[PDB]
Design a protein around this ligand. Structure first.
Ligand SMILES: Cc1ncc(COP(=O)(O)O)c(CN[C@@](C)(CC(=O)O)C(=O)O)c1O
Lengths: 412, 412
């Protein structure tokens, strides 16, 4: 019996964040809390289909004029346009000057992948896999994975979090920018940095931009949480817009998974900003080739929902309210968790819980204290000490607060 | 000002069909016929949303229990199971022995891409990009593209379409199989060969299988037209099932874009058949890693529609009826076209028109005869002589038959 052609395939390590979702679901323990994946939950600890989304879905379901014929390779035109406008602002000079392109993609991950594939073939030469790629220390793990898969051989880290000050290491960040070879690619979190929840202020962003401009560093923005840093979409897009106004050419990978709560419809957009309009045409032509051999053309449901919402001023307005609701709820949980930990007289400071923005808190728990929490208390979180604040409710706040308190006093 | 980082990116060369369709659209002649279309069309030249699909979409729209939370990386469990079962049959020995895995993917294209990526890393050694990959001559345009992008350096062709006989070159095909290095990968069209419509008969498939078994050639089935082809789901999956029965390990990239008419919802499945059950978990663990860096997790809408249909006996029954309607309309166009060509005493043999299966047909027209039809008759088709039978209607059949009659007699 000839051996199987799969005889030697090793067992891969699981994608942790997703593994935890499964683990958590298979947990019979009644006290279990999922503080893993960045997904919104109500105070009832339920998934929330945004009111505007439910409204648009019914409208779509009753629109007999729609068919299922293939979308264009780059995607739904109206979606591409609305998505780019959301990041850049209605008044962007880049939009006026027609030097913006958008490629509908499979969530923020697909936007990152297409961009990385394009750069590996056409940026800083032809098929140059040697240009350094810089990611924050720490970052979302998939940043490494995507760039590695596209072929980049030199992936570096720039200092970002100061474990001591429990904040941004601006000095380290700037030095890392100064030392990077010209033309290096920088993967920047647009807002609500994952996992630290710590973003540069406008003034710090200006310092970062200054070095990047000087050394011809390419900004690759990852905009997965527009609206979650502050509850305001315009405010959260400031950095991107600033770089555009400073005359940078850049990529912006946008995800609508969290701000539209459309996680499973895989709605993303790759926004491209070039110096001149002609370049956009040539870039998009090459992007079509990449898409064609990856997913061929994108799915319609999610993009249709987002296009319908953003293009209807009333719907748009309602949606901004839904986003604010989610952000407001997060603020409230930050306060309550902070308050409780202090009331338990938990060792150390807990101001970082309330200083941090976005969906997460980079708590500071060691990997030993995490293990304790998962195994003993049935509280699921990442090994890094990252917790999803949206997983907290008025009903579980106490269990969590108490469980952290023990981990902290007991596990060293 | 320093030049754009995109200054040297060339404009990609455009795809012929896009142009042709453009041309078609721009044509003022009331007699114009588009035989270059790439999807199903009714007798009225319209897209068709299957009645069962509309019915299920409404059911989904009205189901308040559904949310938009992320699916697992490999996809919706019910979909993966139903899809694999459709291809292999409920009674498949492989299903009963638990040696089948399924990965939800972005249409048939996404299934082929994930399969090619897996093979380039774990098949016939580790990261072996030198294993020959064979595609039919001719084949669906994107086969070459997907395999090349996955890293395969040696893409070959096997003889298939016989220009003179207007049929399969079985002897050429077998010689190509006999001379293929052991472990070479063969991309096989399960049924409704695209673009010729010429398939091996079951007896011929047995000869193909025997060489593959002996030389350890890997069958990578592309199954885009199950049911759609003949109106019979079982008949259309015969070759796949035959290989399973014969003990092969294989991959089967399934598309639901044509048989459910869900083109724009990008619903596909990669079915994996292994010799032993334990292999499946290892193989799927590696596919999860590939998906993670490509699209992260798949969309839900299309997969929900297909899973709902295939798991409800009444809906499944209705769906089979809808598929037969499509298959019958194509059979009818083929029979009528041939009948008319023969009535006109057109030179040559035209049995290939009814021997062929599915939407596409290689007519045997030469480039000059094609030019005449476009230029003189406002009949749009590819220079290869490929036509889509769905471009024919009860209303234009006479025009088209007469026009081909003229092209053959005057240009040949
Ligand atoms: C910084 C960042 N970029 C991109 C994405 C991708 O979003 P997508 O689903 O639209 O492709 C995420 C998602 N991060 C999640 C919410 C889930 C994950 O890891 O995929 C998180 O828990 O970190 C993210 O955190």
């Amino acid at each position: 019996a000839p051996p199987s052609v799969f005889a030697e395939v090793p067992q891969a390590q699981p994608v942790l964040v997703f593994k935890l979702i499964a683990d958590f679901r298979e947990d019979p323990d009644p006290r279990k809390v999922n503080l893993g994946v960045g997904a919104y939950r109500t105070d009832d600890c339920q998934p929330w289909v945004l009111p505007v989304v439910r409204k648009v879905e019914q409208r779509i379901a009753n629109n007999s004029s729609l068919n299922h014929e293939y979308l264009p390779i780059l995607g739904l035109a109206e979606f591409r346009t609305c998505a780019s406008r959301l990041a850049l602002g209605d008044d962007s000079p880049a939009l006026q000057e027609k030097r913006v392109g958008g490629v509908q993609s499979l969530g923020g991950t697909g936007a990152l992948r297409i961009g990385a594939e394009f750069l590996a073939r056409w940026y800083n030469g032809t098929n140059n896999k040697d240009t350094p790629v810089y990611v924050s220390s720490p970052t979302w793990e998939n940043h490494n994975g995507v760039f590695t898969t596209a072929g980049f051989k030199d992936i570096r880290s720039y200092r970002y979090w100061d474990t001591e000050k429990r904040g941004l290491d601006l000095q380290g960040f700037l030095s890392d920018l100064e030392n990077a070879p010209e033309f290096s690619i920088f993967v920047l979190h647009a807002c609500a940095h994952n996992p630290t929840g710590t973003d540069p202020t406008p003034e710090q962003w200006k310092q970062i931009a200054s070095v990047m401009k000087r050394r011809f560093l390419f900004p690759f923005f990852d905009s997965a949480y527009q609206g979650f840093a502050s509850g305001n979409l315009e405010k959260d897009a400031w950095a991107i817009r600033y770089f555009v106004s400073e005359g940078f050419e850049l990529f912006c990978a946008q995800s609508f998974s969290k701000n539209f709560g459309l996680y499973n419809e895989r709605v993303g957009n790759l926004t491209v900003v070039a110096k001149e309009p002609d370049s956009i045409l040539r870039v998009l032509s090459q992007m079509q080739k990449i898409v064609r051999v990856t997913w061929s053309n994108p799915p319609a449901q999610g993009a249709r929902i987002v296009a319908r919402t953003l293009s209807d001023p009333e719907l748009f307005h309602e949606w901004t309210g839904n986003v604010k609701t989610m952000a407001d709820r997060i603020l409230s949980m930050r306060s309550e968790l902070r308050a409780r930990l202090e009331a338990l007289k938990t060792p150390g400071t807990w101001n970082h819980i309330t200083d941090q923005i976005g969906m997460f808190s980079f708590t500071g728990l060691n990997p030993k204290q995490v293990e304790y929490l998962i195994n003993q208390k049935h509280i699921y979180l990442l090994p890094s000490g990252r917790i999803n604040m949206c997983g907290l409710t008025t009903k579980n706040l106490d269990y969590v607060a108490t469980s952290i308190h023990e981990a902290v006093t007991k596990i060293q």
